[PDB]
Amino acid sequence: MACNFQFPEIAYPGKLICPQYGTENKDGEDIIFNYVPGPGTKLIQYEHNGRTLEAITATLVGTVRCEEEKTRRTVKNILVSVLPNDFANNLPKEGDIVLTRVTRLSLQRANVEILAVEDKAATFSVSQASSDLGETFRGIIRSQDVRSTDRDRVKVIECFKPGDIVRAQVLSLGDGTNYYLTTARNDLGVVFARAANGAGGLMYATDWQMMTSPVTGATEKRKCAKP
Amino acid sequence: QDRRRLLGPAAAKPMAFSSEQELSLHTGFIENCNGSALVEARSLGHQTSLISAVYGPRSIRGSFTSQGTISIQLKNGLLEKYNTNELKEVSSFLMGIFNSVVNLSRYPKSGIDIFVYLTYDKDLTSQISSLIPHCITSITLALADAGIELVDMAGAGEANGTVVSFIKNGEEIVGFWKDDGDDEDLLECLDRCKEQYNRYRDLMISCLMNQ
Amino acid sequence: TDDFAFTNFIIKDKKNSLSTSIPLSSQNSSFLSLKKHNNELLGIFVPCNLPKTTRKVAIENFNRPSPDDIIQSAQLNAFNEKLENLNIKSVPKAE
Amino acid sequence: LETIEIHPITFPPEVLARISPELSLQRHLSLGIRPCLRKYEEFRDVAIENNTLSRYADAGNIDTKNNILGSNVLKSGKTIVITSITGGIIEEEDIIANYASVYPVVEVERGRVGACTDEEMTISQKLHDSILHSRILPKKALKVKAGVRSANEDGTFSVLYPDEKRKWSYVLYAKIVVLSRTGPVFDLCWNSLMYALQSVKLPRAFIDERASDLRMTIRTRGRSATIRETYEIICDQTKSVPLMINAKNIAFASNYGIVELDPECQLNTVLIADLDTEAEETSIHSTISILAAPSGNYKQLTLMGGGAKITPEMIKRSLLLSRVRADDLSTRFNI
Amino acid sequence: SEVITITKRNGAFQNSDSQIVTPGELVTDDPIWMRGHGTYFLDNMTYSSVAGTVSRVNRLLSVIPLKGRYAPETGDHVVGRIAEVGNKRWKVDIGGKQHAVLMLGSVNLPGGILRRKSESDELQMRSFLKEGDLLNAEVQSLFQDGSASLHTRSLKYGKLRNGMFCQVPSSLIVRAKNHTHNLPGNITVVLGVNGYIWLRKTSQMDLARDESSWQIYSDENDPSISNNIRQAICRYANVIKALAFCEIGITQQRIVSAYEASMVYSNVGELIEKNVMESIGSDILTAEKMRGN
Amino acid sequence: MSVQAEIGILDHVDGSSEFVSQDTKVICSVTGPIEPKARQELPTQLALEIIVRPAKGVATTREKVLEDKLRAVLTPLITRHCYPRQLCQITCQILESGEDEAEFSLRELSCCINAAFLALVDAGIALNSMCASIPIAIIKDTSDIIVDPTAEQLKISLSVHTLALEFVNGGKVVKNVLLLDSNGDFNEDQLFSLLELGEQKCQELVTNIRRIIQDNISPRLVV
Amino acid sequence: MSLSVAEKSYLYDSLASTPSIRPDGRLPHQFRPIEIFTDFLPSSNGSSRIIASDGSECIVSIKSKVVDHHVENELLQVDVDIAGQRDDALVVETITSLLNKVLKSGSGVDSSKLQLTKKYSFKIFVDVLVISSHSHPISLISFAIYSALNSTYLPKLISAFDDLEVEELPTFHDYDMVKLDINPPLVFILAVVGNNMLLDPAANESEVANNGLIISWSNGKITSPIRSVALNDSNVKSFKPHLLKQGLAMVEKYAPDVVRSLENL
């Protein structure tokens, strides 16, 4: 896509998007432009014409979209990012959500196997990892992130059990041993669970901390997901 | 026999015995894999089909690693017979090219599992040198389809059992192989293989353009 | 205009020209291109099992909930009542 | 309560299955369709190409780097099965021990770096087992004899045929690899095996004059028995006579599921034919595998009643579906 | 030759008494001595336990090792590198029998003096110090495990940068509290007790004796390292491999005399060859005999 | 004889049994609920890791096919949700097959299934229902069904069939069929004959195992 | 990695400039001190112990059998085995391949110094034990094989066998050995860090290098195998035709001197 007067509509690996520095006069006045890559781009080095050249080169097959982080006019910083199963294009990282399932409950924490990563929603992907396609990796939900209205005395047994399916945002990468989750927001928590502590009817959220069993007649308390 | 697999009678022994090419590409044709490619090359000499599948980015947690890594399995064809060691060499070769082409820094704790299936090779008329363009064509396509970052598309020719891989429009070389070619082929081969790379470059770009 | 702009143009035109745009003769004896387009059940390389449009009816069933649920992701009264309980508690934190 | 909301947003089918295959399966089931979004009693279509991989694919080319006896590529859904059948040579009614078996390796690729996994090994042995109990290959057929290959001093060589001391039988393997398994693969492996087996030819085999007095001088550093006779037998594929096989005992497989639908568990007994997605493989615990042959003979039914109700009424319908599928495949590829 | 050195041999695989170098042999039956390290006993009869000499260290006549793994002590200042990064400590490789510990109450940090870090996380530790990074740290208390609690706490202490690695046996350098000093050509050697040697261009912290506070554990390689600076460091590290080779002590004056003696040869790669390493060590001994020490 | 069963014979293991069926002889142990391995931790479920080891030679691929067959049957027999995140290792050692191991697995399998039930009864792990399994062949000489066949009768088989059924509400109402593995040629009228007979012959076997466990448990547990 | 971030940049700068000074401080044509020790097995045909300056040690041993060669298409078998690695890790088997191809018959090595009559060849069993590795072994193995194969003594034939002498197995003289002359290749490793091409990387250099080029010298000239390799994963870059042509030129000049010094001890 056009963003100025030098952008390609369609890009591919190894194809220039734009020069590292630009210029155009808007209102009789030059505006130096300073381009940097983000995800789906790299700034790659070159020599051409007997001089060093540096340039913005697409890495991924897609539409060339502009976004921001922001001579005798300001420099304006334009990030360059070419967005295009797709677990090969995201790994768990910050600001991606993951779909996780509790593979062990513990005193101040919960090991939760990652079965899927959400696109950075309306655009969703599924992890290639499965317990039937082999390999596992896990991240941790802590006692501190369960809620955030009260959260330093709400234990994870009071809100979770094993086998519950939970949507959580990856808070940080953290330590190399785990991914640090947060379920704190009002759109994260248990997507669904099964009554009778993970053995009964399939139950869904009917309050933000109660899931009504359709087969026992009773509420099974949790932390819950919301839209 | 063995505990992990059935191997039938063990005192039993095998049977004793008695641009000049067209590459047509395909992708995204089988699913349980993040991207796949198919390369069939036909030539006077021999016709060949190579399948590739690339699995992951996968997380490899319980350890922090400086950056990601690439792991290459070649699998012996069902109609071609090679020593395990040669497959290792070629795996090692391809890894060192891919190390240079795939950018690895957007992905901490990464291992990528690449599978090269060297399924069919058939002569109508070493050998392992000849299929290196085709392996490099296949795998690149697959990394592109999945959404794995790449510096430039990787691609190579074969001139006289000599394989030279370039990126950046013939300008840079990312690998060199010579095995049982003739002494002082250097100019002929580099000129001849540049032609080949520029020619298969655009083919891969046009496969990626139907999607 | 600038020297930068000219070099950029020469390089970019060089890449664009590299690809060019030739069709591809198939000459496919493996039959992979039909497999790629599995399509419906009235397609190519599929058996028939429904004489109706298989996909479209499924898609339609997708289509009826999605605008309704995505917009009404906090418009129902349960959510609105719950938002107030969060919002009241939320306030002493901000201030 | 009574106003409603707090159900999460809509997830695509795949993502829905990763989240809960129990859930995703039942939801699909209510509209009357499989999770692969097709009706219960349709299947996956089967496309084969044969002799595109075998040694004997051409008549004007016999090349010595090839030895593949019979071969098939079979594609169903996205799941592709490549079968190669390969010989060896071992010097040696209705009784099970007069029928022989293929000694397969079945290799499955699901993203596992290995190829020695518990899922693939169980397949391969069970597969040896099916071939035994279906009675396809009588041991008389691999029991071949040898003629004479005598070289002349007339600068010619005569390899003399019997009508096709010691005796020999062949053995049969199958190297079957699988790319992008999405459901139960067993039946795919079995379908392709047959088209291959009916494409198998066997090399001819010959021996020299005074074979029983040819020497072995290969073993050394004994201790006695380091000079002896041995038989030595090359195979020549300049002629190959085709496999003698029992057609009646050819089967073609199918796969079934038995599952229940409950309307309060996506908040009787329902029959699915064949399984294609992850969601179907995961949670259709009651399943019947049938190999049916296309005259109303059955060479295996295996029911695994993993928990749910089975009335035999479902079993009675599946044995008919399987023979009619068997009849369809049969006529479809004329093999 | 001109281009290669080959020490030439063929025909074979390779080329008195001393105080108790076999355990199982009777050191003493005295019950007041031999109570310390490198002995064991049945009764008071002590039969050695290691190889070495008997000699009085401290208050006790004791078997003392001939050579062995580096042993930490309090007051030592050592140069060493990160093996592991944890949630509460770095594990440090000093070349000892196990790893030494370096932890959060014991570490100066770039961005202040202790700032840029508000909670413990394995990440926040890791950003400053990566595995394999090299850093000069002093021994805070020696524990009886083997383990040594280390500390960085000055603005001279912390990362070693702008240099080249060199390494020796730890028993062929002088044992002192400090041995880190300026040498001619204005390079500084940073020389621990553990055998690890960093040689770098004289920077602010070592230039202030004759600092930094945002560069304590932050990565930075100056672009202002020049030709003659680099060559000085190659020659310096080489002459140090001559005294190492010759199995004598390394004192700062031996390095300066060695450095100057090596200049009859005009190219720096000629100074790793054996014939020359023996000449350089022979010169220094010759200087020690003429001088009187 | 016909069948004999004993429990409690092994003492170091959580539960155990010895199942003998004529020539065929299987001794079994259930160990657990015990501490999971990390690869065999399942979230809400008890894990099963079953091992079948033949008397002659060493276990191969065959015993994995058997493990799957056993695992199928055992997963709704043992209450999975009774222990979450624990493993149970069931180790079934065959002391005599007395037949040919590759060729026929009819007696071998039926015996393992029964010794597994008993061992689990001794173990104390929850069991929803009674399971037994009986071996059924068809011999070519009369071209007809012979129930609970001997080693000789197996040789002259044209086909062989094991069935296992889940026994509730008095251990006498067939709830479900957990297995019916019918190998060799059969046509439908035989197969429903094999169910019918199958039903009654199972229910006898259930009576006999039922009886055995009472008699052996009763001097132990006293009041 | 096992080095510092700081250390790698210093090196990169050091090496990449015009002088290309490095911890040894060699110009690009010079080689570190190696020690050749030979003939220490009286049981083997020939044997070799080579100790290098990084403290890397290879031991290379030559055993044999005479065999009919018309049922064989291989005469030299390399088995490589690296202490502290198993018999099937990727690097070990890739080294086995390289070495087997370097030593492949009729390709830079004789297949007529190993035959004693035109029906019988000696199958030379090269068996390589690496005692300590922490740098690449292949160059050192190449150099060790040279000294070995010029220390390889074989059985001397009793009498001039024909291929129709009596048509029975060849049979050796009891004591008398034949010296084996045979000129194996010498593998030489070149390293590229910027636009600078340097002979013989040390460990340290290998860890910062963009790529290297393995090339071999047989018979007074350069010859196949030619192979590029990437001597890290994480400091890798690409390179130009002109730098590959300068590395040709460099070996052609500096190789001959080395072969002649190594040949006579």
From Swiss-Prot, chain A:
It holds the Pfam family EXOSC1. GO terms for cellular component: cytoplasm; cytoplasmic exosome (RNase complex); exosome (RNase complex); nuclear exosome (RNase complex); nucleolus; nucleus. Its main location: cytoplasm. The keyword Phosphoprotein applies. InterPro entries: Csl4, CSL4_N, EXOSC1_C, NA-bd_OB-fold. GO terms for biological process: exonucleolytic trimming to generate mature 3'-end of 5.8S rRNA from tricistronic rRNA transcript (SSU-rRNA, 5.8S rRNA, LSU-rRNA); mRNA processing; nuclear polyadenylation-dependent rRNA catabolic process; nuclear-transcribed mRNA catabolic process; nuclear-transcribed mRNA catabolic process, non-stop decay; RNA catabolic process; RNA processing; TRAMP-dependent tRNA surveillance pathway. GO terms for molecular function: RNA binding. It comes from the Eukaryota. Keywords: Cytoplasm, Exosome, Nucleus, Phosphoprotein, RNA-binding, rRNA processing. It is found in: Cytoplasm; Nucleus, Nucleolus. Belongs to the CSL4 family. Component of the RNA exosome complex. Specifically part of the catalytically inactive RNA exosome core complex (Exo-9) which may associate with the catalytic subunits RRP6 and DIS3 in cytoplasmic- and nuclear-specific RNA exosome complex forms. Exo-9 is formed by a hexameric base ring of RNase PH domain-containing subunits and a cap ring consisting of CSL4, RRP4 and RRP40. Present with 5550 molecules/cell in log phase SD medium. This is Exosome complex component CSL4.
UniProtKB/Swiss-Prot annotation, chain D:
Changing residue 134 to F: Interaction with RRP46 abolished. GO terms for cellular component: cytoplasm; cytoplasmic exosome (RNase complex); exosome (RNase complex); nuclear exosome (RNase complex); nucleolus; nucleoplasm; nucleus. It is found in: Cytoplasm; Nucleus, Nucleolus. Keywords: Acetylation, Cytoplasm, Exosome, Nucleus, Phosphoprotein, RNA-binding, rRNA processing. It holds the Pfam family RNase_PH. GO terms for molecular function: mRNA 3'-UTR AU-rich region binding. GO terms for biological process: exonucleolytic trimming to generate mature 3'-end of 5.8S rRNA from tricistronic rRNA transcript (SSU-rRNA, 5.8S rRNA, LSU-rRNA); mRNA catabolic process; mRNA processing; nuclear mRNA surveillance; nuclear polyadenylation-dependent mRNA catabolic process; nuclear polyadenylation-dependent rRNA catabolic process; nuclear-transcribed mRNA catabolic process; RNA catabolic process. The modification Phosphoserine is found at residue 20. Changing residue 189 to Y: Interaction with RRP46 abolished. Component of the RNA exosome complex. Specifically part of the catalytically inactive RNA exosome core complex (Exo-9) which may associate with the catalytic subunits RRP6 and DIS3 in cytoplasmic- and nuclear-specific RNA exosome complex forms. Exo-9 is formed by a hexameric base ring of RNase PH domain-containing subunits and a cap ring consisting of CSL4, RRP4 and RRP40. Interacts with NIP7 and NOP8. Interacts strongly with RRP46. Belongs to the RNase PH family. This is Exosome complex component RRP43.
Curated annotation (Swiss-Prot), chain F:
Belongs to the RNase PH family. Keywords: Cytoplasm, Exosome, Nucleus, RNA-binding, rRNA processing. One of its GO terms (molecular function) is RNA binding. It is found in: Cytoplasm; Nucleus, Nucleolus. It comes from Saccharomyces cerevisiae (strain ATCC 204508 / S288c) (Baker's yeast). The keyword rRNA processing applies. It holds the Pfam family RNase_PH_C. SUPFAM superfamilies: Ribonuclease PH domain 2-like, Ribosomal protein S5 domain 2-like. The keyword Transcription does not apply. Non-catalytic component of the RNA exosome complex which has 3'->5' exoribonuclease activity and participates in a multitude of cellular RNA processing and degradation events. In the nucleus, the RNA exosome complex is involved in proper maturation of stable RNA species such as rRNA, snRNA and snoRNA, in the elimination of RNA processing by-products and non-coding 'pervasive' transcripts, such as antisense RNA species and cryptic unstable transcripts (CUTs), and of mRNAs with processing defects, thereby limiting or excluding their export to the cytoplasm. This is Exosome complex component RRP46. GO terms for biological process: exonucleolytic trimming to generate mature 3'-end of 5.8S rRNA from tricistronic rRNA transcript (SSU-rRNA, 5.8S rRNA, LSU-rRNA); nuclear mRNA surveillance; nuclear polyadenylation-dependent mRNA catabolic process; nuclear polyadenylation-dependent rRNA catabolic process; poly(A)-dependent snoRNA 3'-end processing; RNA catabolic process; RNA processing; rRNA catabolic process.
From Swiss-Prot, chain G:
Keywords: Cytoplasm, Exosome, Nucleus, RNA-binding, rRNA processing. Coiled coil: none annotated. It is found in: Cytoplasm; Nucleus, Nucleolus. The keyword DNA repair does not apply. Gene3D superfamilies: GHMP Kinase, N-terminal domain. GO terms for molecular function: mRNA 3'-UTR AU-rich region binding. GO terms for biological process: exonucleolytic trimming to generate mature 3'-end of 5.8S rRNA from tricistronic rRNA transcript (SSU-rRNA, 5.8S rRNA, LSU-rRNA); nuclear mRNA surveillance; nuclear polyadenylation-dependent rRNA catabolic process; RNA catabolic process; RNA processing; rRNA catabolic process; TRAMP-dependent tRNA surveillance pathway; U1 snRNA 3'-end processing. Present with 7110 molecules/cell in log phase SD medium. Non-catalytic component of the RNA exosome complex which has 3'->5' exoribonuclease activity and participates in a multitude of cellular RNA processing and degradation events. In the nucleus, the RNA exosome complex is involved in proper maturation of stable RNA species such as rRNA, snRNA and snoRNA, in the elimination of RNA processing by-products and non-coding 'pervasive' transcripts, such as antisense RNA species and cryptic unstable transcripts (CUTs), and of mRNAs with processing defects, thereby limiting or excluding their export to the cytoplasm. Belongs to the RNase PH family. This is Exosome complex component RRP42. The gene is RRP42.
